[PDB]
Amino acid sequence: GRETCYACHTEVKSLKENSKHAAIACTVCHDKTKEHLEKGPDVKPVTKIDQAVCGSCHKNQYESFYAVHHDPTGARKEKGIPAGRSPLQDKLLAGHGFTFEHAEPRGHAYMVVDQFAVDRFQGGRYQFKGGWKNYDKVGKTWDILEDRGPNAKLPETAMAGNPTCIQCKSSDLILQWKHLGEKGGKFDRTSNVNDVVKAINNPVGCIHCHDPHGAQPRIVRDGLIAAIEKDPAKNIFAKNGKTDLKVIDFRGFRKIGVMEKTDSRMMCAQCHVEYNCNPGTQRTDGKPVTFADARTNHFPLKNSLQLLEHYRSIDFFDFKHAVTGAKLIKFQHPEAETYAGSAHDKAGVQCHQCHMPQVKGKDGKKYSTHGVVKPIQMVQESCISCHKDYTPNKAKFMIETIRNYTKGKMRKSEYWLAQLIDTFAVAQREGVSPTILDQARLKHEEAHALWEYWTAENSDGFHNPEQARQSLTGSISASKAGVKLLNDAIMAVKQ
Amino acid sequence: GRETCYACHTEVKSLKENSKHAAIACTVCHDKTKEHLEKGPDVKPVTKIDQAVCGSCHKNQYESFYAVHHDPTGARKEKGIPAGRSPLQDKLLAGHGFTFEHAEPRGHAYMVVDQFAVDRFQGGRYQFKGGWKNYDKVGKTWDILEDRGPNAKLPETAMAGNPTCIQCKSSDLILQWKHLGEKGGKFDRTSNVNDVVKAINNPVGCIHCHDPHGAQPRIVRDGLIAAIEKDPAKNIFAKNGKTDLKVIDFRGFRKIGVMEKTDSRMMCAQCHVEYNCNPGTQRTDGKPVTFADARTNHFPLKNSLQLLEHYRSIDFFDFKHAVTGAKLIKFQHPEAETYAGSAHDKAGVQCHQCHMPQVKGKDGKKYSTHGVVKPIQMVQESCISCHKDYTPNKAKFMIETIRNYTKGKMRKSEYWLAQLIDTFAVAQREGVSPTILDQARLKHEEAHALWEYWTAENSDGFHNPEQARQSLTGSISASKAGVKLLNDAIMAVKQ
Amino acid sequence: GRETCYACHTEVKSLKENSKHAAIACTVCHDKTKEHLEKGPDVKPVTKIDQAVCGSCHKNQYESFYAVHHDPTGARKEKGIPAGRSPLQDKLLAGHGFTFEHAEPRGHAYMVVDQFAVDRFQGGRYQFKGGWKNYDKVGKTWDILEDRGPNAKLPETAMAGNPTCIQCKSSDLILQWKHLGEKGGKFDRTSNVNDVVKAINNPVGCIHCHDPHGAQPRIVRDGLIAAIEKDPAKNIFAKNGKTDLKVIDFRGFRKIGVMEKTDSRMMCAQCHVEYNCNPGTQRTDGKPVTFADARTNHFPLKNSLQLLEHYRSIDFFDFKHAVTGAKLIKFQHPEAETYAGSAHDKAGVQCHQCHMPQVKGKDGKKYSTHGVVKPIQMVQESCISCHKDYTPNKAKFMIETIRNYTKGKMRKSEYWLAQLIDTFAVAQREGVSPTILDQARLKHEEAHALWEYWTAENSDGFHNPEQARQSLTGSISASKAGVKLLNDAIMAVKQ
Numbered sequence A, B, C: 001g002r003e004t005c006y007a008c009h010t011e012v013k014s015l016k017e018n019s020k021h022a023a024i025a026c027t028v029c030h031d032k033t034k035e036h037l038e039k040g041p042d043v044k045p046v047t048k049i050d051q052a053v054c055g056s057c058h059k060n061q062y063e064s065f066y067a068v069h070h071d072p073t074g075a076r077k078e079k080g081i082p083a084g085r086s087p088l089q090d091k092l093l094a095g096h097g098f099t100f101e102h103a104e105p106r107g108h109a110y111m112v113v114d115q116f117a118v119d120r121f122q123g124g125r126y127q128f129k130g131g132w133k134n135y136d137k138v139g140k141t142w143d144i145l146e147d148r149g150p151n152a153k154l155p156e157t158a159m160a161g162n163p164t165c166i167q168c169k170s171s172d173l174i175l176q177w178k179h180l181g182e183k184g185g186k187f188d189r190t191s192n193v194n195d196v197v198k199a200i201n202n203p204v205g206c207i208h209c210h211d212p213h214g215a216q217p218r219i220v221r222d223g224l225i226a227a228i229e230k231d232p233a234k235n236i237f238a239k240n241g242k243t244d245l246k247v248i249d250f251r252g253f254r255k256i257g258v259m260e261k262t263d264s265r266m267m268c269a270q271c272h273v274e275y276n277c278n279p280g281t282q283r284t285d286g287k288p289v290t291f292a293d294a295r296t297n298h299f300p301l302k303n304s305l306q307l308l309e310h311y312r313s314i315d316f317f318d319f320k321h322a323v324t325g326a327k328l329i330k331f332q333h334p335e336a337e338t339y340a341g342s343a344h345d346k347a348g349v350q351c352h353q354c355h356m357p358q359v360k361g362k363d364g365k366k367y368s369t370h371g372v373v374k375p376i377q378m379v380q381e382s383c384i385s386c387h388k389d390y391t392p393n394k395a396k397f398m399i400e401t402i403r404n405y406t407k408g409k410m411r412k413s414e415y416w417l418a419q420l421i422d423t424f425a426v427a428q429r430e431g432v433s434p435t436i437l438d439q440a441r442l443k444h445e446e447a448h449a450l451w452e453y454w455t456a457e458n459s460d461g462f463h464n465p466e467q468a469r470q471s472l473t474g475s476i477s478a479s480k481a482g483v484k485l486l487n488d489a490i491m492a493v494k495q
């Protein structure tokens, strides 16, 4: 029937004919095609967004994504603890919902459960069925979780969860979400998150990185496309004033991004970026900033050195610091804007060679693992595959040495930000001029922007050790200047 | 010629005849039996309370108890280090003798030696003979420790040691201590602790948990007996409006509580509980609770959510905080009260099944290891014995995720207690008043009770993950309210 | 024929003649001798300071010195991080150059390159050629390091570097440096540090500890030799009111001291000591002590309990604490003075017995490893080799128990110092008399000297657990007494 179909659907024809899924019948993935043909457009075929469908001919990539492993140091690692990645989180994000719960990332099959379950998502509404003994279960979101209802309370929770959230945890809304979550789809940015979640059965789909119609490498994330289109020539994935991406737009409803070849920097940047997906405040005007605003589904693709002036180049911030009152950027996982322009990036290395390395599955067949690898934990396949002369110790030595040097500056950045913050509050009480407290607000704004980036970022400098050193020394520098002048004012008050 | 004795010791007759300890001559465990008959009861037989008699017949329980293990991470682990179980100890407990030293617990054979030598015990009077190189020595207290004498001074120590303290470190005084440490025996609660220590040759006797005459499961601790006797139907060890304790009293002098079935929850709540074995202060009068008072040898047998009310009820608190003056409860190792009502306790699982798992000896009869275990360190016997589907990685994952989540809240609640103490110092200097300060001081009590319980308790929430989260979020919420009504009042002044 | 040489070089003959080296011709280690012979004394021979030559007949000492090792925890471990050796470094050293960077030690082969590349040396001017990927490279300094230039800057760096630093990283200047760096040689204390770094291709040479001429155990370190000569009956290496060491003063220009027997406390003592090698400030007048003053190249040879007196007595302190203006001593790695009169010292054990344990070559010859060892990593032959009853884990438990107890005190000293500095600052800002801030400042001095000795020393109390206890408790005491004088003096103002 395929020629019948292609009559009103030529983008699928253009993707699929002469592709590597050429021979796959429209019926392996779309149900009720007959009722579509026989009573027309009105009756849509059913497209069950499902890794198992891809799995039936790609068992390795399917079983590797779903394999359960137990890190014996456990999961749900709060960042905010003394020996954690963000030891002065509570002080430095005072005001922000990340103060309720922010844990370290774990495996991809858990991304839906984990966002819905975290204390900051929806007031603790959603919970693991059977609780802790079932924290390692993978598969279907609502086989794993229960919903204790709209009116349930859990103490020391928050209500950060929103529709745009879901776009970096599932390919489930790919046909039910119009571009940037403007209206006209099943869901949009203004939708109740508690409607949206019951539609989310799967983590990141096979379809997120790989065209089902043609097996092309690709991207579906709306905000990323918006960003690769705002800057096709000078964006972090660009080359020669051009990017290996061509947008296909359906009905003016949705868009995909076929790259002529693999750039896992782009597949991975669909979620491993800094992003605004939340309500905010305006810098100029002080007005709230709403889900009706398209800055609430937004990929800046700026690094640590650029992000402050970007969020000023859009009169956008996330939150006032509960003490200093400074208009702060909330930073999240910028692995893409970090990795950009680094040693490995420069050398043509992409996320997949370190994070999805080659393994012998089947009975003796080669593939890329789709359970993403933590490389310190797999130096032979993550590092020595390329660095042929490296011993496991040397590989580990390198990752940890860079981590050590970076974390040293991260930790000092925090010492100074804590010092600014406390110094600010002493200034206020010693009555210090409110004109100056502004000046200091800008210094906390700067010092925070060049620090929080790196706790938000997951590599402790490995992804870009020069950018991390220039950033974090930047932060230390802004805080000392900020504490200097506050301290200067607090003697002048008394002079 | 037992019936001769039985003629006169009838409670002993009842425990011993038809029992597993039927055939044992009285002489085996008592000496001087002739002068007692021949001279009369003025001349008491000697009762050398000693593991090694039990060891003659029970070698695998004796060996495993005294077996010397070295953990390569060491012990004398101070809980008030940055990466410790209680990193904010010195600040949250200020005024408390625990600020002098509080280590993590080690194995049961060290318990007298570590009680005697701790910096908080008796001004450093008692030290390991030959110093650090003998810190792993097991055996008789005074073979291991030396007495520096009463006039020895050692910097930065405390004098928390009293008689009652020994009641959770050894069986040696079982016949030298009237019920509750009331005046009557060789030692009471008013005895000089320096006379008491010379009488303690062994750690916890075999007879602590086991009747010497018939071998029936028992408790000997006068606190634990007393608590249960009080709350006979509803206490944390009950089932169906009663408790499994057959309570035998000897000469109206002392008592054992005997059980038809092994209940290790009770066997361990002889020591692993919250207690008061110390002087304190009445909440109403400000005046002393000396060792005169029965509240200085007291088991609440209540959990985190009940203890502030319990001790409020019996007009008792432990120390004013050094900054805030809050009438605080000092919390100690409430494992039995935390475990009460958890998923494992509801399964009917007891302390012993995780902490004394089935092992085999030289020949290989199956014994319960009396070298108690750290389950994370032996997940095959402690976990996988019962959870048959768990791998070691799985068992480790289940322990550490739960400790991870719980620790995240413990660290957050310590951040909020320190902020609460810090803003109180400020509110004093900012001239807010006894009324606003007495209310904030009330928020310190509550959030101290709902936190310290958990640094006191040794599971980091494994024993009761739901209780922990309820309590620690409660603590956070209380500190948050406290801080709210300080900084508010701090503006009320200068407005 | 070496007899010509000897006629004008008396003291070389006396070292070489009838030694294990005697037969080795002068031309093995000296070029331009035929030129020296003909063209007079005006043509000084070439003697290249070069481990390769010592190497040629001392294979296994050489190869072990240069052997690549990769610690899987990496290197460049900042000490001022929460989990780290000196968590409160940034607060307690506020106003000293170590706040810019201070990492744990690695291998000797790295000593010059880490000295010149550390952020606190010369404004980030020296960096690894090819960056992090070459950070494990050994051998020649200017093979591994690039000079970025005098004009270049790197943010948040310091300029602590000076020629005297090089005396504890290299032997290369043993024929180029007046005794103690006084004026006369190609390099002296007043030299531009960047001229001196050009001359240093090698770390500590074989000649640091072994006489090239007759292979006698010696020290070549000017300021140690000077320390001893000054206090020859009562210094730390003395027995019987005599040190084992004849000082040989060649041309009145350069001293060495030769050993009758191997004393590694002395040899290792050439670097593993507290020193002054930096400008500071006289206490009596507050006047600078510049490189003109011989106190800028100075070995006290005093333990934690003597240094405060010592620096008062020679009228000198390094820096003012940024907050308290306390006249603070900067401590560095006081290892041999820590070790002096410890249980191991008094038992005649030497540094080399633990740190250069016997291992054997491939050819199968036994030797002392010159890749200096971290005992916890290698207890088999740093410990068990002497303590044969010791299991691997007992050796670890022993090291780690001592470290555990000491760091418990160390962190408490740090908590109380931070309390003192936050109280000194409150106290100031509530306007307590300068006389009573002066009282506070002396306690800060005393607290400080008793605490920072142990963060700079490398063992966390293992080397001398008794001295560490008595010093750190002395610190806590000094701090608490300060905190009390400030809180009482605070209440006095507003009385």
Ligand code: HEC
Pocket (backbone or CB within 6 Å): A001, A002, A004, A005, A006, A007, A008, A009, A026, A027, A030, A033, A034, A036, A037, A041, A042, A044, A045, A046, A047, A175
């Ligand atoms: C023109 C006469 C069509 C033929 C022949 C087929 N399809 Fe179709 N399809 C068509 C329209 C005009 C629309 C949607 C627009 C509307 O408002 O009705 C569709 C929709 C689909 C979809 C769903 C997309 C979504 O929003 O979820 C699918 C998966 C689809 N069609 C598949 C399909 C197949 C497999 C066909 C051959 C058997 C086929 N279509 C025929 C128009 C026409």
Ligand code: HEC
Pocket (backbone or CB within 6 Å): A104, A105, A106, A107, A108, A110, A111, A112, A114, A115, A167, A168, A169, A170, A204, A208, A264, A267, A268, A269, A270, A271, A272, A351, A352, A355, A356, A372, A373, A374
């Ligand atoms: C959005 C749909 C994502 C895409 C595309 C990718 N990742 Fe991701 N990743 C995401 C989440 C939400 C999480 C955490 C899940 C949780 O429940 O906590 C992750 C996790 C990783 C990790 C950690 C791996 C582990 O701990 O077991 C790595 C190393 C990681 N992600 C890397 C990665 C790479 C290299 C990608 C391109 C191939 C990639 N991810 C895609 C969200 C999303």
Ligand code: HEC
Pocket (backbone or CB within 6 Å): A105, A264, A265, A268, A269, A272, A335, A336, A339, A344, A345, A349, A350, A351, A352, A353, A354, A355, A373, A374, A375, A376, A377, A399, A458, A459, A462, A463
């Ligand atoms: C090899 C040169 C790498 C490339 C290319 C990328 N990453 Fe990485 N990443 C690498 C290391 C050595 C580490 C340290 C942590 C570790 O496990 O060893 C990281 C860290 C991450 C993380 C944190 C989780 C983890 O894997 O431990 C994430 C989520 C991650 N990296 C993602 C990521 C993405 C999206 C990349 C392309 C932009 C990327 N990494 C590149 C090694 C390498």
Ligand code: HEC
Pocket (backbone or CB within 6 Å): B002, B005, B006, B009, B012, B016, B021, B024, B025, B026, B027, B028, B029, B030, B047, B048, B049, B053, B174, B175, B207, B211, B212, B213, B250, B251, B256
């Ligand atoms: C060891 C295996 C024992 C044998 C055999 C017997 N007894 Fe014992 N007895 C033993 C201990 C360790 C103790 C101390 C207290 C305790 O409850 O554990 C005792 C105590 C007694 C007492 C004191 C009872 C009282 O009034 O307090 C009596 C009167 C006594 N034991 C008597 C007794 C008789 C008559 C025995 C032979 C029939 C006998 N014991 C055997 C340990 C052991």
Ligand code: HEC
Pocket (backbone or CB within 6 Å): B104, B105, B106, B107, B108, B109, B110, B111, B112, B114, B115, B167, B168, B169, B170, B204, B208, B264, B267, B268, B269, B270, B271, B272, B351, B352, B355, B356, B372, B373, B374
């Ligand atoms: C008082 C007599 C006790 C009774 C009854 C029990 N325990 Fe205990 N325990 C006690 C002390 C004083 C210590 C610390 C000893 C020290 O010197 O530090 C402990 C320790 C434990 C530990 C930790 C063991 C380790 O090697 O670290 C566990 C796991 C433990 N105790 C468990 C336990 C159980 C399960 C009991 C009933 C079965 C029990 N204890 C009884 C004091 C006393």
Ligand code: HEC
Pocket (backbone or CB within 6 Å): B051, B054, B055, B058, B061, B062, B065, B204, B205, B206, B207, B208, B209, B210, B262, B263, B264, B267, B268, B352, B356, B366, B367, B368, B369, B370
């Ligand atoms: C309480 C903290 C205990 C102390 C002190 C000692 N034992 Fe024990 N023992 C205890 C429990 C909870 C159990 C399990 C009982 C069950 O229901 O399975 C045991 C068990 C024994 C046994 C029976 C066989 C076995 O399980 O190993 C014997 C023979 C035994 N214990 C002897 C013994 C001796 C000689 C002791 C002193 C060194 C000793 N026990 C101490 C609890 C406690």
Ligand code: HEC
Pocket (backbone or CB within 6 Å): B105, B264, B265, B268, B269, B272, B335, B336, B339, B344, B349, B350, B351, B352, B353, B354, B355, B373, B374, B375, B376, B377, B399, B458, B459, B462, B463
């Ligand atoms: C398995 C279901 C358990 C039962 C039943 C009990 N405990 Fe436990 N305990 C358990 C874990 C997994 C841990 C954490 C630390 C570890 O070693 O894994 C603990 C911890 C303790 C400690 C701290 C010492 C330690 O082992 O690290 C003590 C002193 C302790 N537990 C006592 C205890 C008592 C008295 C119990 C019955 C009320 C009890 N535990 C039950 C696992 C389990």
Ligand code: HEC
Pocket (backbone or CB within 6 Å): A130, A131, A132, A133, B342, B343, B344, B347, B349, B353, B354, B375, B376, B379, B382, B383, B384, B385, B386, B387, B395, B396, B398, B399, B464, B465
């Ligand atoms: C049988 C003797 C058990 C031993 C020993 C341990 N566990 Fe267990 N556990 C068991 C039962 C019957 C239950 C009730 C729920 C169920 O699985 O049917 C549990 C519960 C847990 C849970 C959930 C805990 C909770 O608070 O909800 C976990 C995570 C768990 N068990 C793990 C575990 C580990 C790691 C153990 C060794 C330290 C362990 N258990 C001992 C049965 C038994």
Ligand code: HEC
Pocket (backbone or CB within 6 Å): C002, C005, C006, C009, C012, C016, C024, C025, C026, C027, C028, C029, C030, C047, C048, C049, C053, C174, C175, C207, C211, C212, C213, C250, C251, C254, C256
């Ligand atoms: C290498 C094993 C050597 C051999 C063989 C000889 N010399 Fe040497 N010499 C050597 C070094 C590394 C140095 C630097 C100083 C030090 O003590 O380590 C020296 C120094 C001299 C000097 C200068 C001494 C002074 O005046 O301060 C002289 C005059 C000297 N050496 C002479 C000498 C002669 C005559 C030898 C053959 C009999 C001879 N040296 C052998 C290294 C080595």
Ligand code: HEC
Pocket (backbone or CB within 6 Å): B130, B131, B132, B133, C343, C344, C347, C349, C353, C354, C375, C376, C379, C382, C383, C384, C385, C386, C387, C394, C395, C396, C398, C399, C465
């Ligand atoms: C012989 C050359 C030794 C080497 C190598 C090490 N130790 Fe030692 N130790 C030794 C002696 C002769 C003594 C004195 C005690 C005696 O009876 O002679 C010691 C002392 C210790 C101690 C007690 C330490 C104290 O501070 O008093 C411990 C805990 C100890 N030693 C452990 C130890 C470890 C772990 C070693 C490797 C790092 C080690 N020692 C080396 C003899 C020798």
Ligand code: HEC
Pocket (backbone or CB within 6 Å): B002, B004, B005, B006, B007, B008, B009, B026, B030, B033, B034, B036, B037, B041, B044, B045, B046, B047, B175, B251, B253
């Ligand atoms: C008749 C009356 C007898 C007989 C035949 C025996 N005992 Fe005793 N015994 C008796 C009294 C009045 C007391 C004193 C109680 C007190 O002073 O508090 C005792 C004491 C003991 C004890 C001492 C308990 C303790 O250690 O303080 C023991 C262990 C004891 N008796 C044992 C014992 C045995 C083994 C007998 C048969 C050989 C025996 N008694 C006979 C009274 C009487």
Ligand code: HEC
Pocket (backbone or CB within 6 Å): C002, C004, C005, C006, C007, C008, C009, C026, C030, C033, C034, C036, C037, C041, C042, C044, C045, C046, C047, C175, C251
């Ligand atoms: C008589 C005069 C002689 C003879 C026969 C030799 N030397 Fe050698 N030497 C001599 C003097 C006066 C000096 C010093 C020059 C000065 O003081 O400025 C030296 C110097 C050396 C050195 C270098 C020391 C340094 O760098 O500071 C070496 C290594 C040395 N002399 C070696 C040497 C050898 C091997 C000889 C026999 C071939 C020899 N000298 C002969 C004076 C005299």
Ligand code: HEC
Pocket (backbone or CB within 6 Å): C051, C054, C055, C058, C061, C062, C065, C204, C205, C206, C207, C208, C209, C210, C262, C264, C267, C268, C352, C356, C366, C367, C368, C369, C370
């Ligand atoms: C300072 C300390 C050092 C330096 C810089 C070098 N060595 Fe080595 N050396 C040292 C000690 C304390 C010892 C042990 C001596 C003893 O136990 O009494 C040694 C030992 C040697 C030996 C003898 C063989 C052995 O015991 O291993 C040789 C041949 C030796 N040392 C040579 C040597 C070389 C060639 C060096 C430069 C690579 C070198 N040492 C450095 C102390 C020190």
Ligand SMILES: [Ca+2]
Pocket (backbone or CB within 6 Å): A274, A275, A276, A277, A329, A330, A331, A332
């Ligand atoms: Ca953001």
Ligand SMILES: [Ca+2]
Pocket (backbone or CB within 6 Å): B274, B275, B276, B329, B330, B331, B332
């Ligand atoms: Ca208590």
Ligand SMILES: [Ca+2]
Pocket (backbone or CB within 6 Å): C274, C275, C276, C329, C330, C331, C332
């Ligand atoms: Ca110094």
